[PDB]
Design a protein around this nucleic acid. Structure first.
Ligand SMILES: C[C@H](CCC(=O)NCCC[N+](C)(C)C[C@H](O)CS(=O)(=O)O)[C@H]1CC[C@H]2[C@@H]3[C@H](O)C[C@@H]4C[C@H](O)CC[C@]4(C)[C@H]3C[C@H](O)[C@]12C
Ligand SMILES: C[C@H](CCC(=O)NCCC[N+](C)(C)C[C@H](O)CS(=O)(=O)O)[C@H]1CC[C@H]2[C@@H]3[C@H](O)C[C@@H]4C[C@H](O)CC[C@]4(C)[C@H]3C[C@H](O)[C@]12C
Ligand SMILES: [Mg+2]
Lengths: 502, 1319, 66
RNA sequence: GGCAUAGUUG
DNA sequence: TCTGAATTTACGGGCGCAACTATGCCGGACG
DNA sequence: CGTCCGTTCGCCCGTAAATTCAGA
């Protein structure tokens, strides 16, 4: 009886099928696979599907691309209802046969029942409430869902093989909750802080950084433009560079009155690309918002100011337009990555030689008995850190001012048009640390015990690491992978406890 | 030179360093392990011989009889490997054992026994390993994964700071046997020694010493030194050892011979120690306060009372000394318990424990082991004697004994299997020494402390486990035996051994389903070293210590190839050159360095041996004689990389690839990839799907041929010769006379395996790569299997790639693919699926496979034959009826194609139980199969006869040659010929005898094949007949399919762009694939950019050759350009020459190179950037590797020239049509009326707990309510909701979930009354 | 702490669906506890409107019309 | 269609 | 020699989510 | 074939019980 009620609590859990402790009543009502956490708190639902997500950049922020077959299978009761309503099937068996043969008329029915019926898209680790959002379906001739690029940050979804699930809100209250509460156009700001959550991620920011930029001398430098339209007409016809310093006439609207837009026209000294982008910015924002280089934080604060001044609908339209123009001009830039874009400093070899000479002299100072082992270890670690910092500084300077361009007189320094540097500086992808390992030495590595190694990896990834350096890097990478795997469980347990307490 | 298979297409090798050791047979571990399991071992060390000698002879508890052992034998397998896979049986061989039973009568210890009887008894079957290292267990193909467990022996650990909350490290010692109980000694914060057996209750350590019949005084004499107090005159002048005086505080004045060595109160100095040593000090006077804390060593008695005055191990005080003063005892032995170097741990353990005599120790141990049972002296003695000291219940293997002797600094390495008193004593002494401060604990993750269990070793352990039960049954039966009536056939029960071995091979954590979708996948599943399994760790327990990479993994375990996820670092993969030691440890090769010259001899060093040496790195520059060019070379001495002298070096790495495995050595430019990205690249290279045609990586590493050949998927020629016949499914080779054995002629027939299903539902299909009349040599590929091109591994296809953003269609990680890729059908893959229809003997009537089906029309049944089984070649789609079957009540239960699945039926197999009167289609299949078998046998016989007559004619050209009238007589009448007297006529007679033997064996085998084809089939109990239909779907490409590369660059296809929309260069060629440049900085896999540039260079060479070849030019210019291309390199060592190709191999080579020049970039000795620039400059390509590209749509040029090249893209086995699923309404589970799970069952997505939280965070109360009541488990609610949706009214009745009622019933099923009280 | 505070709740169903189902159910059975299911997890388990979003009006209505 | 095992995906 | 506080020790709780594929099985033993 | 009944080996923490101080 004690084994029936709770098998194994007393001890010596009885087994029935090849040494496997069988599930008793307590085991069926408790644990991760009981009734509470497996069949009551979370359930399997009907009218649900799952598929691999793709990009579909053409989508508007409120809609997602749903495959035709998934939509046909998800909305089968609605299709039956409409077929019977229109007199195409007196009984439900005829409607079922018409749908399973996929006749030419069930597709019009599907298109007219999809019209304004939201679907809930959800990615598997629903960490926060933005992990499930309602979109309007767009029927797609394919088998993969098309997810709007802006919502990827909210979903934490890349497109390396992720899958997302679609749920169909059936009742009218569910549809209106999806449209009024869970719509992707209502979730502009993150619920954890005030910052927006639809910030353009990586290609849009690269396109907007390349477009809103300047060089010391380009095609059509200093010519006077009558407005953004003339700037676009000049760039598209090849008569002027995208980033060329010109004077344009900007008419910006300031709403410092009692909600009334007050015009103000001036001659702004800007670039062609900045005017072309100004063609997108809505009426309420000042022109200073696009007169900078427009990295990632700049675009984030631009969207934040647009939301704070103009509201929701203008902000959504502005975000869609920003994404469109950023993709367009990132494609137009042709911003590639080469093997020559990772410029190795010419002073790296001499810095490494100085560091090796210093470690040799410290070894000489130690073998003579002047210093102990611990202080020698500390001195070596500090001098290698200093050498690594000098190498990083040299490479960063050489990539920041990589370009020295002039043909009308004196040479002038300008911010480099290097591909790697632009991708790092714009905030699109990468950082100082990664670009550092690309070109400069990747620096000190730590043993699995946690202690730092005296000898660092003096080789970047443009050069080839030998066997020992790669082995030490494998130490470091395996430690990080294991830590991530064993840290996800702790974070999940903590957030479950936080949810349950509050 | 090259042997005509490496002379068709020479891969340009950019490897600077010269190779020393050839890459071994990569499947050596599995084959070598299993070979020493079945093969006969006269010494009896390995295999079934060891098990039989360990178990047999079998006696009884009394001296009645004895069943001994003679030999064993493996019979011929009943079914071939192909037949075994087709039928579904296990591929095994019957194990027949000769046994002699002897009977002992009254007083016959040495006399003749009553009767002896030897018969070949049969005890089970053992599955056999195929020639590729795999097993066939139930028609599927499985691999037994080698296990990396903790080596038997003694280990010492610390438990540094997880206890006592004070930083005081403990010191435990564990004695792990190969088969037995664990003995653990431990310390505590109070510094008392404790012991435990099988990790039970912690009882004091000296209990086991007493159980070994050791008294207290001898225990103290064994674990301590003796201080002697002699009362010569007075004040107890103590005999003193001058060495014992270093490290303590002198409480008195150490003076002797008028020379005060140590003053009062002051400590002992080293100067005074030297003075005492050189002054020959033996006895010194002591005060009275010194003895007050000392402990007496042994016992003493008084002369008056005659009884004990002071027991051993008791602190001496003034009272004890006074009492022994009058007894007459002058010599007193005491323990030397130093505070910091010789602790009194055994003394405190003797104090704490309550045991005083041996019987008390044994009863305490019996009570600990068996709790609550009434203990007995005899039972306790037997239990302790069989715990560690019986060869049945405890056995340290040879490895256990070796490690035990090594860890105790013993001399010999061979000893007894069981423990002894001295072994436990030495373990305790070593643990005490570790506690005191001398010595260090061992590291468990060290590869010198972890063995390699393999398939043979585990199989023989399971065989021993099975034999133990049979031995017990035979021992029991020998006491109830009708001795002079029976042979040892009914004595042996063949069911337990066979059941144990089948349980191990079929259902085990290591005998796992083979990952067969790629030659690399198979060859890396066989070389898999898992730390889990029986006797190993578990992924929920181990952590942070076995997961990470250890410094002894260099050359033995791959650091980058490990599955990321639940078990990272537990499923390590064997390195390229790593072998298994004689004792099971992993060892790696090294080139010996005796003098400054690096000797060309190879020594295999394990982890412990390698620990004390200096091994120069593989990338050490050498001259022709062999010397380190630099005066300071980078080496590693003791798990630590550093810089060492030119002379000190003792060993060098054999090759630069020896640190990585066979999956990570196929990545060109691995040294430029970040470790995480390289790990992902290897793990995804394992998952490439074999496309329609392999495409020979332009940028390889040179390991492609080794991986393709060593894994068995090609048809490597066994003996060299001349190709005689080549069709799609068969190759015939006429062996050269030099390689032809004296006797049989003597030609090879290779039956290619055409389209067949793999374990992953992919296509296995061997294609001939040789033409008719083409010479081949030994070891050349004749047919390339799946993912193989001319014997080189070829997983994906190499396509023209451009790195540039393209309108967001490669936004985050996506790929952009042109329509040219899908038009050329180059990523199109064939997937073969097997669908089974079974007719089961159910109640209310059996199931028939007739074509008479109700509820369907004749257009639906038109694709079936008269017997209700679809024709071979019918293009069935989703919903079509494959196999017509009805079940009695009649209702339609026919096997139909699953929805969404198309394809062509390529092969239909019918399995019929004996005596079920197979239908017409089964008869047709079996008669056509028998005709095919007869055709194959006749064709092989006539091919062999053509070869035999060719050899006879070649012999007949010398010594009486007849060519005019030889054909006048029939070619069969060659027995009555005319010839002289020599051995040639004897050879002719030998050929005739072998021909007669061929005829007889052909008749016998034809009868055997007819019997094996016409017979019934052993089906499952209750099934009448099984019909299996093999569809062959063809998956081309679509937005959603995940493609990848070799450097961890993933990405799902997002759009199939039109051919004219893709970017194109100045020549008009569009790029096949557009990738995102932004994935390179963050994920530091720079190796893909270098692969792109080098592939662009290779394709430029190929385009130059194609231009020079399509408009015909002389061979002189062609060979000049090819030689210039092959001579391009800084210090490369390939050095191929073209003056020896004879103008017809240059043309063939140039024809093979016109689609690009294959290039080998070794894994760490690869092509430098400067060489890539030079090779680009050899063509008409820019040095920077970037060309200006024009937009396809607008036509305007992209500024910022983009990186174009050729990247070797792979198509992983994650297809969107296998991932897409949707469900409106379907089946529901039984216990809870919730939708089923998965997609094989038409199941529903799990709106889990976090999704419920996410809806709660919104205001979506109605969406959540319909999610967890109406759409999941409210039966009335969901029926009403479906009716309302069909009626056009979207409104739900809430109801109450059925799972809540289930929970209520389950809680009420305990003694708990839970109810829903009234409103 | 969060786990101790989430186990020492006046509603025993939340604590049972959290960790330690056996102990919580034993305590609730012995003490004869009564659960008003006035939280968010209890109404999910029971299968009615959550008293947070659009269901807050329904719960207020059922309190006013009790 | 339930469990277990093994592998894989994010 | 009794009795309360503090310490130590043994023991029960917990240890992310979603998805796919495969095999083995549900039991080994008398009429 | 038809039937038919009996394997220790992880980490962390809270909590109750056993043990040991430390008196008067
Ligand atoms: C004789 C041979 C070395 C020759 C010198 C010794 C050295 C190590 C021994 C093996 C290991 O112990 C592991 C395993 C233990 C099992 O119990 C029995 C089988 C195994 C394979 C043993 C057979 C044999 O005894 C070995 C190979
Ligand atoms: C050139 C070769 C002789 C070499 C000396 C001749 C003599 C015997 C011939 C084959 C045999 O007939 C068997 C088989 C019969 C099939 O139906 C057609 C193919 C096969 C392979 C024949 C092709 C070829 O013609 C063979 C190899
Ligand atoms: Mg992802």
């Amino acid at each position: 009886v004690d084994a029936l009620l709770d098998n194994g609590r007393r001890g010596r859990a009885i087994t029935g099928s090849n040494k496997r402790p069988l599930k008793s009543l307590a085991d069926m009502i408790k644990g991760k696979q009981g009734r509470f956490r497996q069949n009551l708190l979370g359930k399997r639902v009907d009218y649900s599907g799952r598929s691999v997500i793709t990009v579909g950049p053409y989508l508007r922020l409120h809609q997602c691309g749903l495959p035709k077959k998934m939509a046909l299978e998800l909305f089968k009761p609605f299709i039956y209802g409409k077929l019977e309503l229109r007199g195409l099937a007196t009984t439900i068996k005829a409607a079922k046969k018409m749908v399973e043969r996929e006749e030419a008329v069930v597709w019009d029915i599907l298109d007219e029942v999809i019209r304004e019926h939201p679907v809930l898209l959800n990615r598997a680790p629903t960490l926060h409430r933005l992990g499930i959002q309602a979109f309007e379906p767009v029927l797609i001739e394919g088998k993969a869902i098309q997810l709007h690029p802006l919502v990827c940050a909210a979903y934490n979804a890349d497109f390396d093989g992720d899958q997302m699930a679609v749920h169909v809100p059936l009742t009218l209250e569910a549809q209106l909750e999806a449209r009024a509460l869970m719509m992707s156009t209502n979730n502009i700001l993150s619920p954890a802080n005030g910052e927006p959550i639809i910030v353009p991620s990586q290609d849009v920011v690269l396109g907007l950084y390349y477009m809103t930029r300047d060089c010391v001398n380009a095609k059509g430098e200093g010519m006077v433009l009558t407005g953004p339209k003339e700037a676009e007409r000049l760039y598209r016809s090849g008569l002027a560079s995208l980033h060329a310093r010109v004077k344009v006439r900007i008419t910006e609207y300031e709403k410092d009155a009692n909600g009334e837009l007050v015009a103000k026209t001036s001659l702004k000294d800007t670039t062609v690309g900045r005017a072309i982008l100004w063609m997108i910015v809505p009426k309420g924002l000042p022109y200073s918002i696009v007169n900078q280089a427009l990295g990632k934080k700049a675009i984030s604060k631009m969207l934040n100011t647009c939301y704070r001044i103009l509201g929701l609908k203008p902000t959504v339209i502005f975000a869609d337009q920003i994404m469109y123009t950023g993709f367009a001009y990132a494609a137009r830039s042709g911003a590639s990555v080469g093997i020559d874009d990772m410029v190795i400093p010419e002073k790296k070899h001499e810095i490494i030689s100085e560091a090796e000479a210093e470690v040799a002299e410290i070894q000489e100072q130690f073998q003579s008995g002047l210093v102990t082992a611990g202080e020698r270890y500390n001195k070596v670690i500090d001098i290698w850190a200093a050498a690594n910092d000098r190498v990083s500084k040299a490479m960063m300077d050489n990539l920041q001012t990589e370009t020295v361009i002039n043909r009308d007189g004196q040479e002038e320094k300008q911010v480099s048009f290097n591909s790697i540097y632009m991708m790092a500086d714009s905030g699109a992808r990468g950082s100082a640390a990664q670009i550092r390992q690309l070109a400069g030495m990747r620096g000190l590595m730590a043993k699995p015990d946690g202690s730092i190694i005296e000898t660092p990896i003096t080789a970047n990834f443009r050069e080839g690491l030998n066997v020992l350096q790669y082995f030490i890097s494998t130490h470091g990478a395996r430690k990080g992978l294991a830590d991530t795997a064993l840290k996800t469980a702790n974070s999940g347990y903590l957030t479950r406890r936080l949810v349950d307490v509050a | 030179v090259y042997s005509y298979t490496e002379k068709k297409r020479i891969r340009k090798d950019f490897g600077k360093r010269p190779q020393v050791l050839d890459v071994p047979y990569l499947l050596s571990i599995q084959l070598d392990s299993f070979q020493k399991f079945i093969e006969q071992d006269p010494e009896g060390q390995y295999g079934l011989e060891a098990a039989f000698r360990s178990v047999f002879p079998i006696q009884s508890y009394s001296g009645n009889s004895e069943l001994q052992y003679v030999s064993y034998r493996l019979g011929e397998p009943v079914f071939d490997v192909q037949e075994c896979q087709i039928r579904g049986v296990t591929y095994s061989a019957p194990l027949r054992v000769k046994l002699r039973l002897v009977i002992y009568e009254r007083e016959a210890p040495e006399g003749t026994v009553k009767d002896i009887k030897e018969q070949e008894v049969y005890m089970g079957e053992i599955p056999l390993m195929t020639d590729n290292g795999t097993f066939v267990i139930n028609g599927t193909e499985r691999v037994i994964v080698s296990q990396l467990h903790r080596s038997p022996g003694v280990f010492f650990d610390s438990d540094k700071g997880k206890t006592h909350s004070s930083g005081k490290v403990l010191y435990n010692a564990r004695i792990i046997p190969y088969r037995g109980s664990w003995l653990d000694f431990e310390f505590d914060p109070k510094d008392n020694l404790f012991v435990r057996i099988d990790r039970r209750r912690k009882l004091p350590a000296t209990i086991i010493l007493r159980a070994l019949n050791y008294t207290t005084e001898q225990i103290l004499d064994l674990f301590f030194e003796k201080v002697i107090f002699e009362i010569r005159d007075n004040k107890l002048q103590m005999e003193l050892v001058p060495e014992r005086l270093r490290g303590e505080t002198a409480s008195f004045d150490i003076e002797a011979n008028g020379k005060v060595y140590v003053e009062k109160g002051r400590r002992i100095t080293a100067r005074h120690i030297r003075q005492l040593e050189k002054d020959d000090v033996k006895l010194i006077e002591v005060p009275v306060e010194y003895i007050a804390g000392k402990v007496v060593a042994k016992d003493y008695i008084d002369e008056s009372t005659g009884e004990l005055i002071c027991a051993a191990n008791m602190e001496l005080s003034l009272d004890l000394l006074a009492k022994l003063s009058q007894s007459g005892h002058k010599r007193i032995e005491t323990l030397f318990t130093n505070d910091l170097d010789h602790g009194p741990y055994i003394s405190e353990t003797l104090r704490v424990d309550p045991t005083n005599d041996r019987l008390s120790a044994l009863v305490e141990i019996y009570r600990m082991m068996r709790p609550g049972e009434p203990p007995t002296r005899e039972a306790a003695e037997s239990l302790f004697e069989n715990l560690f000291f019986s060869e049945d219940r405890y056995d340290l293997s040879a490895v256990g004994r070796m490690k035990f002797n090594r860890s105790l600094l013993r001399e010999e390495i061979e000893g007894s299997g069981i423990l002894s008193k001295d072994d436990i004593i030495d373990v305790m002494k070593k643990l005490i020494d570790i506690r005191n401060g001398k010595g260090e604990v061992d590291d468990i993750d060290h590869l010198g402390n972890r063995r390699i269990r393999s398939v043979g070793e585990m199989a023989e352990n399971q065989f021993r486990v099975g034999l133990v039960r049979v031995e017990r049954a035979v021992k029991e039966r020998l006491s109830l035996g009708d001795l002079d009536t029976l042979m040892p056939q009914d004595m042996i029960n063949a069911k337990p051994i066979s059941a144990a071995v089948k349980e191990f091979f079929g259902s085990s954590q290591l005998s796992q389903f083979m990952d067969q979708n790629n030659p690399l996948s198979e060859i890396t599943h066989k070389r898999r070293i898992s730390a889990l399994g029986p006797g190993g760790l578990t992924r929920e327990r181990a952590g942070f210590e076995v997961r990470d990479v250890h410094p002894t993994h260099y050359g033995r375990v791959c650091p980058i190839e490990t599955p990321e996820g639940p078990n990272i670092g537990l499923i390590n993969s064997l390195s390229v050159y790593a072998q298994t030691n004689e004792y099971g440890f992993l060892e790696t090769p090294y080139r010996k360095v005796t003098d400054g010259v690096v000797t060309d001899e190879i020594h295999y060093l394990s982890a412990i041996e390698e620990g004390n040496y200096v091994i120069a790195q593989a990338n050490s520059n050498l001259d022709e004689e062999g010397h380190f060019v630099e005066d300071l070379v980078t080496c590693r001495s003791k798990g630590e990389s550093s810089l060492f002298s030119r002379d000190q070096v003792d060993y060098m790495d054999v090759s630069t690839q020896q640190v990585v495995s066979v999956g990570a050595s196929l990545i060109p430019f691995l040294e430029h990839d970040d470790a995480n990205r390289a790990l992902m690249g290897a793990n995804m290279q394992r998952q490439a799907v074999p496309t329609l045609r392999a495409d020979k990586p332009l940028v390889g590493t040179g390991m492609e041929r080794a991986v393709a050949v060593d894994s068995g998927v090609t048809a490597v020629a066994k003996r060299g010769g001349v190709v005689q016949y080549v069709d799609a499914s068969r190759i015939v080779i006429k062996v050269n006379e030099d390689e032809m054995y004296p006797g049989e002629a003597g030609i090879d027939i290779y039956n290619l395996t055409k389209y067949t299903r793999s374990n992953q539902n992919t296509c296995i299909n061997q294609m001939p790569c040789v033409s008719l009349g083409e010479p081949v040599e030994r070891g050349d590929v004749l047919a390339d299997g799946p993912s193989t091109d001319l014997g080189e591994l070829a997983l994906g296809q190499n396509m023209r790639v451009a790195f540039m953003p393209w309108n967001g269609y490669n936004f985050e990680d996506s790929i952009l693919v042109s329509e040219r890729v899908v038009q050329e059908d180059r990523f199109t893959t064939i997937h073969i699926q097997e669908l089974a229809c079974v007719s089961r003997d159910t109640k209310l009537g059996p199931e028939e496979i007739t074509a008479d089906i109700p509820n369907v029309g004749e257009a639906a049944l038109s694709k079936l034959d008269e017997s209700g089984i679809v024709y071979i070649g019918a293009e069935v789609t989703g919903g079509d009826i494959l196999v017509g079957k009805v079940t009695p009540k009649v209702k339609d239960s026919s096997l139909r194609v699953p929805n969404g699945v198309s394809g062509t039926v390529i092969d239909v197999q019918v399995f019929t139980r004996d005596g079920v009167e197979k239908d017409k289609r089964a008869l047709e299949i079996e008669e056509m199969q028998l005709k095919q078998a007869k055709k194959d046998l006749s064709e092989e016989l006539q091919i062999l006869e053509a070869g035999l007559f060719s050899r006879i004619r070649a012999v007949l050209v010398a010594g009486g040659v007849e060519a005019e009238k030889l054909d006048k007589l029939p070619r069969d009448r060659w027995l009555e010929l005319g010839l002289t007297d020599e051995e040639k006529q004897n050879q002719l007679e030998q050929l005739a005898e072998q021909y007669d033997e061929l005829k007889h064996e052909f008749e016998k085998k034809l009868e055997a094949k007819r019997r094996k084809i016409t017979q019934g089939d052993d089906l499952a109990p209750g099934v009448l007949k099984i019909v299996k239909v093999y569809l062959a779907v063809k998956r081309r490409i679509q937005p959603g399919d995940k493609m990848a590369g070799r450097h961890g660059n993933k990405g799902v296809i997002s759009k199939i762009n039109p051919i004219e929309d893709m970017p194109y260069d100045e020549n008009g060629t569009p790029v096949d694939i557009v990738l995102n440049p932004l994935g390179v900085p963050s994920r530091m896999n720079i190796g893909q950019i270098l692969e792109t540039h080098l592939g662009m260079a290779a394709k430029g060479i190929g385009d130059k050759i194609n231009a020079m070849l399509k408009q015909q030019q002389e061979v002189a210019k062609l060979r000049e350009f090819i030689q210039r291309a092959y001579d391009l390199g800084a210090d490369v060592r390939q050095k191929v020459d073209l003056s020896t190709f004879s103008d017809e191999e240059v043309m063939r080579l140039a024809e093979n190179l016109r689609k690009g020049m294959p290039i080998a970039t070794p894994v760490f000795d690869g092509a430098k950037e400067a060489e890539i620039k030079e090779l680009l400059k050899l063509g008409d390509l820019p040095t920077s590797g970037q060309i200006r590209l024009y937009d396809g749509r607008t036509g305007e040029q992209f500024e910022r020239p983009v990186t174009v090249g050729y990247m070797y893209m792979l198509k992983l086995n994650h297809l969107v049509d296998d991932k897409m699923h949707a469900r409106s309404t379907g089946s529901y589970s039984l216990v809870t009326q919730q939708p089923l799970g998965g997609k094989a069952q038409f199941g529903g997505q799990r709106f889990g707990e976090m999704e419920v939280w996410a809806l709660e965070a919104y205001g979506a109360a109605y969406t959540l309510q319909e999610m967890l009541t109406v759409k999941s488990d409210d039966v009335n609610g969901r029926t009403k909701m479906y009716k309302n949706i069909v009626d056009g009214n979207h409104q739900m009745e809430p109801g109450m979930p059925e799972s809540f009622n289930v929970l209520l019933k389950e809680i009420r099923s305990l003694g708990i009354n839970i109810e829903l009280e009234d409103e | 702490g969060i786990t101790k505070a989430s186990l020492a709740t006046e509603s025993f169903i939340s604590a049972a669906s959290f960790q330690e189902t056996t102990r919580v159910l034993t305590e609730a059975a012995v003490a004869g506890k009564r659960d008003e299911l006035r939280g968010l997890k209890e109404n999910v388990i029971v299968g009615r409107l959550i008293p947070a979003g659009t269901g807050y009006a329904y719960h207020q209505d059922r309190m006013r019309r009790r």
